């Protein structure tokens, strides 16, 4: 409406220009973000339709915005400045002076928009058009170099960011001068602090993978980055090195398919014993492996190496010997177990995508190592909770900063989601006959993704339109057969009748349901767009029991798709799944007289045991039965004549078993029923 | 020679680069001078393996760096160097200015201090490297004695401040303080010596030593940024009134100041209120003589950020209501004459105001029709439908009209909106007495209708409402 009311009428508003701005200011100072998107169109047609005074007073007041500012507002206002710089940068231009001047007053912008804020003013400096007013680059310049030059790393983040940014926008020989030479000045200003070198090897390696520049200043930095990574960490494989150690040190972890004696291990104990360099290890290696794709196109002939080489480690035999020491080399040994696991995980980041099935059982045996770490290290956590290995991602998580899931989704490298390519091969099963662990990994990081996508760096750069859409095909045609071999397995496992392989695929279970419900509950399914997706998607649940059946209407698939996923609830082990699998039927269901599916379904689940295991009865929580309850009790006809059901039942709930004739009734369950029982009551 | 150094440089540090350090004794500025002859990316690389080979543990070390700092400090002001190598220079001293002791810092920066007193500084690129070594001297804690850093950092800025500064490094010299960490003291010394430093300056290089001073008040001190701005410009009006008893240049230069200070406004609201408070009149009666034609075409320039709108105009307002009232009191009595020197009134400076507008100010334009039809609005009769409700009310309702008749002859933009402003009074009220809206309909049709042929729309949608009107304000 607000398109077309300027795009036509522009010349009765014309005339009105300051009101309108005196409109859009007070709509970004809400909350409400439609409010807010509301005026930041305001500023943006304002800005493209009057003359140019009105443009200027835009400008000004978008900058005052910034400067002045609280988050959102400040996040807004650089928005609409990408835009107008996109759209006419001619006329953005001649109002540079005051988008200059916002670099006095960088103490209020956090370092997420200053990424943006150095992207505008290089946007608009490198434009050889107005290089007469390259007073921009000047100002720039200085504010960098001040930054850089200084102990507090809260201005050398500045520095770094800003300064890595306009390289990378600078970079489509003078200017290539300019950039190394600026690069170099950083690397210089970030050596002496640890972090500080990573968060530029971070910045650097994400400036590479989302814009990809002439290769000139990258073939100039790369012939520096292999040269010092091959001395820094790449030692020949000499058992012991110098150096006084009080630590057996063995080359661990390596392949075995590899000959021992050989050239390439990589020095970890020696590097950070040195220290009390090795702190970028992961980011460095991202480095490498990126600039190596751009070079290379996806070959990575010369690091091959890199992913099988044993590691110069200590003894990483669980250490119950090595008790009461936890002193500092406690820390030395949590962080380095710490250190070698993002290593390893930027591993099978880089060598998932690649096709050989060798190579591909290589990138396997590196999964269950990391798990394996993993269980080592919360081993050594277990030991000691106050001993911080304290190592941030170092792109946002590590300024955020500067206990397993905190570290589980802060600390370590972050996965990519090329890395669920893996699992398009098909499990194998040790106990009935890639392990339940090794999917286990993957589903946990799954799910986290898209919580927090859909309801954490080099994600948030994709839209969550591309991340579901390539969950679509990298889950869903893949995970089917993953998902009937579960099945296949739990029916053998049910027919038949160690505790800990089911117990893993059980929460594996628990995680595909759960990523199903963040997929399946996607509000873009609720606009007019994505619905050919769902013709894609449930018509492929729909084939799991028959083809043939091709161009169907809506509710057939519907209900071909809730007829192949129903007969599922024989083989659920626990409640949460359970909840998790009828609320995926509830809120796929609802894209189509309805309710006696979903009644008899949770009636199925009501009057199912969910059996007695003592930590599998600690997962029928309140909160659980309560919402089940609601579901069913909403979804019967007779609410109240089903009070008398459950009331009526509800008193040989004593006479019969302390556990019912209607299963999920204990002592302690009551207080659930009675709310839910009254709460429907309620509604 | 330099190649060798490279090579040495190349594998390892503190090995042979300190022996070596040990060979070579003397003539490191002429291979600086050779090396920027030749290039200054090998320049670069030789100050990173000399500062590499040159730890600040070890003494031996410490004068060699100092002496290559004088020789870069020199060179990079005085040497006609490429920019890339500046830069590279500049950074690189920046960078490695933290590992030292005291007096090695403190030395180097009596060093700048008598260098911008006296010595000729060719550019004054190099006080870039200033603040960085007066931050260094901050966080310094390792003791001297003539004291903690900090209080070393306060004797430099004393002397600095207090010795003469070059006509040609107050920018830079303001721009360099940006960045220490002041308190209020020293902030308010730095303000002093710049403010003090206004007359002795070309006019085109205030606006920007005025723009640093406002980035710079944000610390401590804005009354005297302020004080000092209005009272600069009230003195040299004052000098061009009584010359005529430049103006393009004057003018174009308040018309600078004036933005400068209403964008700082805008990013700072404390700039606002301390604005408001430094010239408001009604203190408990008295009229100010910090009021002028300057400051007061900053209080109609700074109407048109909406929160300061209406504070800005009752300002203004009381401001013309007591100047009436005084003038009344000395003309009614020889012996307030004889004693009071004649001053300006605040009716004389608004004309003054209108006249001065007339170039590039639209800014202030709008806010003195917002303020003549406040005094018009408020201070028109109702009485017939007594001196002080009467002819200081009288006086001022006069005042709005002169305003705006002499804003409506030279702005030919605010016609439109003055006569359908008082159109829309005349039409519109028609019960409250509207005798002096009529009379200023009659001036400014009586001055020029040839100026109302380019705004007669305005006049004749007037005229469909004349049925509805009383029948002596259609004969009106």
């Known amino acids: 409406l607000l398109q077309s009311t300027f795009s036509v009428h522009y010349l009765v508003l014309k005339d009105m220009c300051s009101s309108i701005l005196s409109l859009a200011q007070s709509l970004l100072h809400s909350l409400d973000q439609s409010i807010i998107s509301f005026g930041s169109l305001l500023y943006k047609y304002a800005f493209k339709f009057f003359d140019t005074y009105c443009q200027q007073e835009v400008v000004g007041a978008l900058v005052t915005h910034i400067c002045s500012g609280n988050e959102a507002e400040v996040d807004t206002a650089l928005d609409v400045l990408l835009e107008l710089v996109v759209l006419n940068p001619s006329a953005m231009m001649m109002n540079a002076v005051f988008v200059k001047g916002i670099l006095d007053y960088l103490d209020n912008i956090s370092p997420q928009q200053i990424r943006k804020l150095f992207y505008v003013l290089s946007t608009l400096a490198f434009s050889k058009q107005n290089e007469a007013s390259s007073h921009i680059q000047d100002d720039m310049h200085l504010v960098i170099r001040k930054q850089l030059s200084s102990t507090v790393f809260k201005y050398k983040l500045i520095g770094i960011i800003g300064a890595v940014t306009m390289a990378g926008i600078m970079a489509a020989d003078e200017q290539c001068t300019q950039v190394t030479s600026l690069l170099q000045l950083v690397h210089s200003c970030s050596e002496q602090s640890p972090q500080a070198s990573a968060l530029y090897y971070d910045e650097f390696a994400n400036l590479i993978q989302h814009e990809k520049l002439d290769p000139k200043a990258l073939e100039w930095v790369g012939q520096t980055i292999c040269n010092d990574f091959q001395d820094a960490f790449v030692v020949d494989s000499c058992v012991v090195p110098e150096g006084d150690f009080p630590f057996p040190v063995k080359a661990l972890y390596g392949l075995e398919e590899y000959d021992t004696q050989n050239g390439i291990a990589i020095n970890l104990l020696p590097l950070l014993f040195s220290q009390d360099s090795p702190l970028c290890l992961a980011p460095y290696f991202r480095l490498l492996r990126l600039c190596v794709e751009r070079q290379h196109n996806g070959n990575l002939e010369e690091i091959d190496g890199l992913l099988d080489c044993p590691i110069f480690l200590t003894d990483l035999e669980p250490g119950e010997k090595l008790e009461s020491m936890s002193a500092k080399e406690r820390s030395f040994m949590c962080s380095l177990i710490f250190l070698t696991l993002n290593w390893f995980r930027e591993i099978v980041n880089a060598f998932c995508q690649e096709t050989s099935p060798e190579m591909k059982g290589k990138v396997l045996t590196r999964l269950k190592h990391i798990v394996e770490l993993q269980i080592i290290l919360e081993k050594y956590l277990a030991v000691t909770p106050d001993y911080v290995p304290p190592l941030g991602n170092f792109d946002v998580e590590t300024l955020d900063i500067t206990l397993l899931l905190h570290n589980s989704h802060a600390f370590f490298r972050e996965l990519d989601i090329e890395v669920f390519s893996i699992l398009h091969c098909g499990l194998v099963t040790k106990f009935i006959l890639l392990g339940p662990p090794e999917l286990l990994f993957l589903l946990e990081d799954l799910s986290q993704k898209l919580e927090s996508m859909l309801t954490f760096s080099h994600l948030q750069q994709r839209s969550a339109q591309e991340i579901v859409h390539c969950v679509f095909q990298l889950l869903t045609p893949m995970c089917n057969h993953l998902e009937n071999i579960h099945n296949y397995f739990q029916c053998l496992a049910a027919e038949n009748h160690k505790v800990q392989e089911y117990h893993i695929m059980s929460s594996c279970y628990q995680r595909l349901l759960q990523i199903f419900h963040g997929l399946f509950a996607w509000s873009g399914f609720s606009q007019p767009e994505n619905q050919n997706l769902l013709y894609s998607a449930l018509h492929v649940l729909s084939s799991r029991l028959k083809q043939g059946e091709h161009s169907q209407p809506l509710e057939e698939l519907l209900s071909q798709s809730v007829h192949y996923l129903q007969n599922f609830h024989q083989s659920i082990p626990s409640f949460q799944c359970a909840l998790y699998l009828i609320r995926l039927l509830m809120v796929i269901l609802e894209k189509s007289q309805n309710k006696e599916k979903i009644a008899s379904l949770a009636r199925q689940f009501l009057c199912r045991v969910w059996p007695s295991g003592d930590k599998e009865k600690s997962n029928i929580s309140n909160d659980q039965l309560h919402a089940l309850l609601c579901i069913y009790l909403e979804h019967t006809e007779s609410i109240l004549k089903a009070i008398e059901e459950i009331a009526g039942v509800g008193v040989p709930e004593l006479i019969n078993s302390p556990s019912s004739t209607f299963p999920t009734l204990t002592r302690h369950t009551f207080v659930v029923f009675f709310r839910v029982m009254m709460a429907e009551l309620e509604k | ?476």
């Not at chain 2, 290039?39 to 000399?50: E, N, Q, T």
């Not at chain 2, 070309?202 to 401590?220: D, F, H, R, T």
Request: hydrophobic content about 40%; aromatic content about 6%; glycine content about 6%.
């Open chain 2, 1 to 476: 020679m330099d190649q060798k150094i490279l090579s040495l440089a190349a594998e390892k540090t503190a090995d042979k680069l300190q022996e070596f350090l040990q060979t070579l004794r003397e003539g490191d500025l002429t291979n600086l001078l050779q090396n920027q002859a030749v290039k200054g990316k090998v320049a670069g690389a030789l100050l990173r393996a000399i500062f590499k080979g040159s730890p600040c543990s070890e003494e031996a070390g410490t004068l060699r760096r100092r002496k290559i700092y004088t020789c870069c400090i020199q060179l990079v002001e005085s040497g006609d160097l490429q920019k890339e190598i500046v830069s590279e220079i500049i950074g690189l001293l920046m960078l490695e200015a933290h590992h030292f002791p005291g007096p090695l810092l403190v030395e180097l920066a009596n060093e700048f201090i008598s260098a911008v007193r006296e010595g000729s500084l060719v550019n004054g690129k190099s006080l870039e490297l200033l603040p960085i070594i007066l931050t260094v001297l901050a966080t310094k804690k390792e003791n001297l004695a003539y004291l903690s850093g900090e209080e070393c950092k306060k004797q430099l800025i004393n002397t600095l401040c207090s010795g003469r500064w070059d006509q040609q490094y107050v920018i830079q010299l303001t721009s360099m303080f940006k960045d220490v960490p002041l308190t209020a003291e020293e902030v308010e010394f730095v303000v002093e010596k710049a403010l003090s430093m206004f007359s002795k300056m070309n006019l085109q290089e205030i606006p920007p030593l005025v723009y640093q001073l406002l980035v710079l008040s944000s610390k401590g001190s804005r009354k005297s940024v302020l004080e000092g701005i209005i009272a600069f410009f009230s003195a040299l009006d004052k000098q061009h009134n009584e010359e005529q008893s430049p103006s393009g240049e004057l003018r174009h230069v308040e018309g600078t100041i004036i933005l400068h200070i209403v964008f700082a406004i805008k990013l700072d609201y404390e700039l606002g209120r301390e604005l408001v408070k430094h010239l408001k009149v009604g203190q408990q009666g008295d009229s100010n003589n910090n009021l002028s034609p300057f400051s007061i075409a900053l209080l109609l320039s700074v109407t048109r950020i909406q929160r300061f709108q209406d504070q800005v105009l009752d300002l203004l307002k009381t401001s013309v209501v007591k100047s009436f009232k005084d003038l009344q009191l000395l003309q009614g009595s020889k012996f307030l004459q004889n004693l009071v020197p004649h001053r300006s009134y605040v009716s004389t400076m608004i004309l003054e105001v209108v006249k001065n507008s007339v170039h590039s100010w639209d800014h202030v334009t709008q806010g003195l029709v917002e303020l003549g039809f406040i005094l018009m609005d408020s201070y028109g009769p109702k009485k017939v439908l007594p001196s002080l409700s009467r002819m200081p009310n009288q006086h001022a309702c006069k005042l709005g009209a002169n305003i705006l008749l002499e804003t409506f002859k030279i702005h030919e933009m605010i016609r439109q909106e003055i006569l359908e402003q008082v159109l829309n009074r005349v039409v519109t009220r028609a019960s409250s007495p509207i005798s002096h809206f009529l009379d200023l309909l009659s001036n400014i049709v009586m001055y020029a209708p040839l100026v109302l042929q380019n705004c007669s729309s305005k006049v004749t949608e007037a005229f469909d409402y004349l049925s509805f009107l009383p029948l002596q304000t259609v004969q009106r």
